[PDB]
C-alpha cells in the first residue's frame, strides 16, 4: 500500500504552463491536495468547488499572516497573491516521510499535520514553478509500505 | 604553555605582604567557609578573595585543566566568569565584590 506523505505530482494543461500539484496522504487515506495555476494561485483542492485560499487555511491553522510570510521562503510570491482529524492523522511513517521530502526538524513523536508542514509544502510547490524542485515517482518502493 | 590565569584574565597575588593585607580592608571583608563540595558559580561582578586556610582548585567551564591557589594567594575573579570550584578540606576565605573601579 502507498505510504503516507507529500507527493508533488505535475500535470500539463491543454493550453498554457504545466499545472503542479502536491498531495498529502494520510493513514486513513485523506487527500489534502494543493495546486498552482499560471499565477501563484496556491489553491487547495480539498473542497469540491473551484478552489480555496491557502492563506485562509493558514490563518485558521493559527498563523497571524505575519510569521507566515516571515518563515516561508520567497515571501513575495505568497504576499502578492490577493474530516479534520483523519486528514491530520499522519502515521509515524507519514511523519518521517514528510520530514524527508520537506526538510523539517519536527520530532518523530509529533505525528500530526502541523501548519509549518503545510507552509513548507506551499513553499516547495511555488519553488517547483521556478524549476527548483523534483517531482516524485509514485511507483518507487520508498513511497510504499508493506502490511 | 601559557598559564590559564593569563587566558581567563585571572589575576592572583601569591604571598601577599602584611602591608598589602592591611590595605583594601582585607580584615573587614565578609567571611565564607566550606568543607568538601562543588560550587558552580557565575561572577556577575569582580570579586577579590583572600583564601586564609584551605586550598581551592578551579576549572573553567568545559576545560580539562585547573588553576590551583594556596592560602597565601589573593585571587580576583573576572566578570562573566563561569567556573567550578572544588574543595577537599576546611576552606575559609574573605570575599569582597567590587564594582567598576575599586
Amino acid at each position: 500500500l502507498q505510504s503516507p506523505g507529500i507527493y508533488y505530482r505535475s500535470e500539463l494543461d491543454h493550453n498554457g504552463i504545466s499545472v503542479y500539484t502536491g498531495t498529502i496522504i494520510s493513514d486513513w487515506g485523506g487527500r489534502s491536495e494543493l495546486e498552482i495555476d499560471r499565477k501563484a494561485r496556491i489553491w487547495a483542492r480539498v473542497s469540491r468547488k473551484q478552489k480555496i485560499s491557502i492563506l485562509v487555511l493558514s490563518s485558521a491553522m493559527g498563523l497571524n499572516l505575519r510569521e507566515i510570510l516571515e518563515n516561508v521562503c520567497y515571501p513575495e510570491i505568497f504576499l502578492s497573491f490577493l474530516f479534520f482529524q483523519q486528514r491530520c492523522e499522519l502515521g509515524r511513517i507519514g511523519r518521517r516521510n514528510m520530514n524527508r521530502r520537506l526538510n523539517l526538524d519536527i520530532p518523530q513523536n509529533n505525528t500530526f499535520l502541523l501548519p509549518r508542514d503545510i507552509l513548507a509544502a506551499a513553499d516547495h510547490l511555488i519553488g517547483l514553478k521556478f524549476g527548483m524542485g523534483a517531482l516524485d515517482d509514485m511507483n518507487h518502493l520508498k513511497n510504499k509500505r508493506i502490511r | 604553555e601559557k598559564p590559564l590565569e593569563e587566558l581567563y584574565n585571572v589575576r592572583v597575588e601569591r604571598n601577599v605582604t602584611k602591608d598589602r593585607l592591611m590595605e583594601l580592608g582585607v580584615p573587614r571583608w565578609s567571611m565564607w567557609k566550606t568543607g568538601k563540595c562543588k560550587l558552580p558559580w557565575d561572577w556577575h561582578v569582580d570579586q577579590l578573595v583572600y583564601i586564609e586556610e584551605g586550598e581551592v582548585r578551579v576549572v573553567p567551564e568545559g576545560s580539562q585543566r585547573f588553576m590551583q591557589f594556596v592560602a597565601g594567594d589573593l585571587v580576583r575573579y573576572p566578570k562573566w566568569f563561569e567556573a567550578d570550584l572544588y574543595f577537599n578540606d576546611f576552606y575559609q576565605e574573605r570575599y569582597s565584590f567590587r564594582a567598576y573601579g575599586d
Binding site: - | 593569563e6 584574565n9 569582580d46 573576572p78 566578570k79 562573566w80
Partner: protein
C-alpha cells in the same frame, strides 16, 4: 622598563596658536596632563612584561578586554588620545574639507553643513568628560561620528580615527570656563587640521579600500 616615555612634542609650537588658545593652557594640558599619564604608563608596563611588549593599539585593545578594562587601559588610552589630539590640530585655520575627504563626507553626511551640525550636536550632547571622533568603519566602509566616555577610543572596535577632540574639562576651563559650544565652534572654524585627517584617511585606505573594483566584461 620605560617605554612610550616620550612626551610627544606638538607639530606646532606651544605658542603657535596663541590668538585662540593661550600658551599656558597648552603648556598645562601638555606639560602636566600628558606627562602625568606616560610616567604612570611606563610604571605599569615595567611590572608586567606581557603587556610591555605590545604595540600601543594592540596594548589598548588587549587592556580593554572586551568590556572589562584592565588597570592599564586608562593611562595608555589617555596618552594615545592626547597625542592624537595634539597632532589633529594645526597652526592654520581649517574651514574646508580636503578633496578626498569631501567626497566621503558628501557620500555619507550629504553635506559639510550637516556634518558640522551633527559634530557640534554630538559634542554638546556628551555630558561629562570624553572625546568625540570622526572614524571610518572597516565593516561598512563609511564615515561616522562617535562619542566616547572618558578615556575610550575607537581602536577598541577596529575603527580608524581621522580626527578627535578633548571634551575633558581640563582642556577648556582655563580659557573658557563654561561655554562648551564656543570651544567647539572655535575648534571647528579655526583650530582643526583637515590635512592631517586626509593623511590619516590615505593611510587607512591601505587597510580599508573606499572604492569600486573593475569588473571585466566577459
Amino acid at each position: 622598563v620605560f617605554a612610550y616615555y616620550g612626551l610627544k612634542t606638538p607639530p606646532y609650537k606651544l605658542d603657535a596658536l596663541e590668538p585662540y588658545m593661550s600658551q599656558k593652557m597648552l603648556e598645562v594640558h601638555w606639560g602636566e596632563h600628558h606627562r602625568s599619564y606616560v610616567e604612570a604608563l611606563n610604571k605599569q608596563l615595567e611590572k608586567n612584561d606581557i603587556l610591555y611588549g605590545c604595540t600601543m593599539e594592540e596594548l589598548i585593545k588587549v587592556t580593554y578586554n572586551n568590556g572589562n578594562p584592565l588597570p592599564e587601559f586608562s593611562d595608555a588610552a589617555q596618552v594615545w588620545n592626547h597625542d592624537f589630539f595634539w597632532e589633529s590640530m594645526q597652526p592654520g585655520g581649517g574651514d574646508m574639507p580636503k578633496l578626498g575627504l569631501l567626497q566621503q563626507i558628501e557620500k555619507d553626511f550629504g553635506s559639510f553643513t550637516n556634518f558640522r551640525e551633527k559634530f557640534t550636536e554630538a559634542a554638546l550632547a556628551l555630558f561629562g568628560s570624553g572625546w568625540i571622533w570622526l572614524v571610518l568603519k572597516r565593516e561598512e566602509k563609511r564615515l561616522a561620528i562617535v562619542k566616547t566616555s572618558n578615556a575610550v577610543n575607537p581602536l577598541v572596535w577596529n575603527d580608524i580615527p581621522l580626527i578627535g577632540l578633548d571634551l575633558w574639562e581640563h582642556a577648556y576651563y582655563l580659557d573658557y570656563k563654561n561655554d562648551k559650544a564656543k570651544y567647539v565652534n572655535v575648534f571647528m572654524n579655526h583650530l582643526v587640521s583637515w590635512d592631517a585627517a586626509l593623511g590619516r584617511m590615505a593611510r587607512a585606505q591601505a587597510f580599508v579600500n573606499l572604492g569600486e573594483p573593475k569588473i571585466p566584461v566577459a
